[PDB]
Amino acid sequence: LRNFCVFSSVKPLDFCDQYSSPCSSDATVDDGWFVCEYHASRFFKMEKLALAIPDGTGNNYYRTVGKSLVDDKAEGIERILIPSQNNYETVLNLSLLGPAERLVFYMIYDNKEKQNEICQQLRMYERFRPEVVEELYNSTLRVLALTNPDAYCAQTNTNESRSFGLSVEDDLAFNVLPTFIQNLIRKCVAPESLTIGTEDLQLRNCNTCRITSEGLLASVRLYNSVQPKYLYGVNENRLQIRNVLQFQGNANALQQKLSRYELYQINIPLFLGKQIIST
Amino acid sequence: LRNFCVFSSVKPLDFCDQYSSPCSSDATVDDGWFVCEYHASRFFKMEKLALAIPDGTGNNYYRTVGKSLVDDKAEGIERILIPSQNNYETVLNLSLLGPAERLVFYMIYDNKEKQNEICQQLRMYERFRPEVVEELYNSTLRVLALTNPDAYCAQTNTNESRSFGLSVEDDLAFNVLPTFIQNLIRKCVAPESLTIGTEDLQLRNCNTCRITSEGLLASVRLYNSVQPKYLYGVNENRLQIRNVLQFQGNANALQQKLSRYELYQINIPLFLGKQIIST
Amino acid sequence: LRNFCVFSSVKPLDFCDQYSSPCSSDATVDDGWFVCEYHASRFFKMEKLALAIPDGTGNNYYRTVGKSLVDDKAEGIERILIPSQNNYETVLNLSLLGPAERLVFYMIYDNKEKQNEICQQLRMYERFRPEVVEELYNSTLRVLALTNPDAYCAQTNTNESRSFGLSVEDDLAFNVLPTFIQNLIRKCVAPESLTIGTEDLQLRNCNTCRITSEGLLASVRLYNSVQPKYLYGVNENRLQIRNVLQFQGNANALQQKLSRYELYQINIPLFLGKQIIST
Amino acid sequence: LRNFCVFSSVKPLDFCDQYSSPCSSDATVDDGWFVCEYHASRFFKMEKLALAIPDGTGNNYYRTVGKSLVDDKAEGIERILIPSQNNYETVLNLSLLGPAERLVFYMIYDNKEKQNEICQQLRMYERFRPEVVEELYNSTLRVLALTNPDAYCAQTNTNESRSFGLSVEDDLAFNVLPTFIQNLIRKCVAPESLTIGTEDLQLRNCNTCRITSEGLLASVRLYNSVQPKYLYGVNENRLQIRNVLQFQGNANALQQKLSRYELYQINIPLFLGKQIIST
């Protein structure tokens, strides 16, 4: 597939796709997220990070992890990274989104009546472009089937096991998430303790997120101040005012002489659960 | 001072200083550690990292933090990053160290009889080089006085406050550490929650070390696999065998295509305590 | 026979046989193992060694012996060199092996229903290649008959006698092994004391293996570190991580000057039982 | 030292040294035996072997081990590899040995009256060659002092520990051996289980020799049939008849086709005791 992004087929009527930041080449490769960096940052409010695991030789067991983009000052529906069926309409703000985005999200969450009424309202557009709708639906449905744990092929790797907490509520809630949402969640949060073969590698002793009935949240108020490089960039006649935290400083307080050491950026990777890798 | 390193004046009889890796230019600047990167890695088994704190504009409140060099597989006197007066002789292995190093460490820990007998055994060398000893002692003593919280000048900044735990034993033990050891410890571990002005920035919700009666330890078995670039490098006729962990892989398992994302190295910065910064 | 290896007829549908390391010319000659070096190393985890017995003149009574390939660190189903009917499916990991290998192993262990269902599932392939199956079965069955102690010819040499311990359980368990397995076991382990003619030659006073109800095992934790030169070599997207033991050293510790003496490699030949050779 | 062999200074009156096989270059290097291969084979009836310990990378922790030269058919004073003070005169057959050899052996075993009477009988030779005796005595005495655990320098490595059995009698007897004999014994027998660092490598589970009150013996009747390549080679008008074991064979029994596999010679390395290597 040249485009593994689910939101790759998101087009207006006369489509020079919105893409203020063009979709990254990550959609071309099969890393398993099935979403490009731009769509991940815009919708799920997370970026992609290459988790490197050294072993003392030079080669690193590379992995994909989610990088939080929400700030510690946030509260409410803004702190949720990935919503569940309960309130995803309000979280993703599907009311004013483009009809292709609405369709894609609704049939990812699989609520029949919503895409039914989308088709009813899209019938008027259908007389101009009667071919894009079917191919868009086919591509998105086949992507969902590929990421679906149960299908015809149903490619299953029981050797990898993911635990999202020692409590019953956490995994019982995680069970009812959509198949694509489950696949994205399992492969965006790094394990707390990667159990590989007959040993355990303690990647992190603290969780940077939480899985609950409404989905994946940045529950901990870890301080984050990274700016998204693939911002929406649309002309904002609708103003969103925010409480920015800024400090002053001189050349002495801004210690440039400390810059020679390799930098340890304050990023917020998603760490939760245990990864059981037999053998 | 051209050389803030305490172990800067560590010379043999005919001195082309050991320094398999030459002392970094960090000793030239006053970052407060008063130890160069080579001596920090060799003795305290830690490196130096530039903790950058973004605020949403581009300037970063730079800070110095300690980077752990011990492995998760370690146990015993090897897991302690900085020893106290109780067992520093065994931790630093002062038995076979060079006499300058022995002197420096002993008068840092301030045990009179040890440097007294060092002087008695150094009397034989004194007839050849009767001038290096006094200047070495003067320089090291003035460095200790500069890092001493109480002195003539006694430059004190009460506005910064450091907490090393909510328990009585932790700070009561931290109180009895040597003055230079206390200064190094306070400025090598990053705060758990940097309380600055009227706000708090949650740098990390989990501690990566511990302060106890014997000193600063890497109590948590966080997985570390970084190699020191300033290793001792001395011809080792005395063999130290270690249990190395290695995994195999092909080009597919070594996902080079994941390398385009900016890397998130598995490092182990020292995070503990709360930094109270009024105003 | 140009090919005495039992696994010589192991072919896929379009066969350029897997053989990352091609089968050695040992299958061409009749040494009695009836398995090539590659198949012995891959399945039974042992290599072949030429046991030479000097007598003070120059000619050596050559013999074939098994060389252990398992490490002292191993435990479990990995330490067994040759399995019995009890758990050979798990030992050889027949679940994912090629259908020819599954058939060969199952009819060596003679469990009717397994090769019956192999034939049922192979019926679909049968319509493309209806001639290879019968000749493969005939060749493997005639090899088993040749190695079978009881047959039409039933070539028996009662003069050679093999003892696998002084205990009742050891030989009573060895009795119920398959005929080919018994032939391989009798001619892979060197005798503890070769009783030849009217004298006894003490080859070794210690056993390097054990014969039990589950088969031939490397019970003793003898240190082995030889690498197989006929490794499987298949692209491993399924990762097997292992605990490697490595030591460092300089030119002095790696004493090259000791290399002029003829080397005594730390190998682990299979030594067990007594060989009674009348006359 | 160009010559570490103790018997390097063994010269007749008109010396073109006996040395039917010239002394090997092993005396030039410091492997610690302080005896050349020829003298080790002639007197102690053992050869030198390079014990190689693989670790899975390619470098081998080389070591020196003793290779037995006695046959399984032997009995009596012939089976002892190294004698003690009790019966070394009969074991080494010092009655007819050259006076230099007698002197060297006697002052290695440190029995004053014997070398005293050697000097008394050598007084007649002294008038012709009054300079070789003093330098020979000085060289041999300094070699003994160098191999002496207690001396002025007394170079001691307490980190290496050697155990020669779990019984009190074995090590209590080994204690009273001469210093050079103790040094040779400790560095000719390979450990049963090399305890290195925090792990143990089981080199061999069976002992190939024994340490008793009379010294180091080949107690086990392990079958040995290697011929010494540095034999005495002196014209033997005094005939030693021995019971040789020989077998016949044709081209079929002498299986040349088995020679392609790398040979596993039936040698008898000296294995006994445990080597405790801290770190």
mmCIF file of C-alpha atoms in Angstrom, chain B residues 18-21 38 42 96 231-240, chain C residues 248-255:
data_model
loop_
_atom_site.group_PDB
_atom_site.id
_atom_site.type_symbol
_atom_site.label_atom_id
_atom_site.label_comp_id
_atom_site.label_asym_id
_atom_site.label_seq_id
_atom_site.Cartn_x
_atom_site.Cartn_y
_atom_site.Cartn_z
ATOM 1 C CA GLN B 18 46.759 9.421 33.371
ATOM 2 C CA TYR B 19 43.694 10.841 31.598
ATOM 3 C CA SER B 20 43.151 8.129 28.968
ATOM 4 C CA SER B 21 40.316 10.455 28.045
ATOM 5 C CA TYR B 38 35.909 12.061 33.122
ATOM 6 C CA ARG B 42 35.181 7.196 36.563
ATOM 7 C CA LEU B 96 44.904 0.680 44.779
ATOM 8 C CA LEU B 231 36.355 5.058 30.070
ATOM 9 C CA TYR B 232 39.404 4.355 32.220
ATOM 10 C CA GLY B 233 41.119 2.628 29.294
ATOM 11 C CA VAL B 234 44.003 1.252 31.362
ATOM 12 C CA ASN B 235 45.661 -2.015 30.319
ATOM 13 C CA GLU B 236 43.647 -4.568 32.310
ATOM 14 C CA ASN B 237 45.793 -7.504 33.360
ATOM 15 C CA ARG B 238 43.173 -7.822 36.118
ATOM 16 C CA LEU B 239 40.079 -9.183 34.398
ATOM 17 C CA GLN B 240 36.523 -8.081 35.202
ATOM 18 C CA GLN C 248 37.095 -8.627 27.915
ATOM 19 C CA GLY C 249 40.852 -8.836 27.581
ATOM 20 C CA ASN C 250 43.997 -7.204 26.279
ATOM 21 C CA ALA C 251 46.891 -8.679 24.304
ATOM 22 C CA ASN C 252 48.472 -9.859 27.566
ATOM 23 C CA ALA C 253 45.385 -11.719 28.807
ATOM 24 C CA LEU C 254 44.887 -13.166 25.307
ATOM 25 C CA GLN C 255 48.158 -15.071 25.461
#
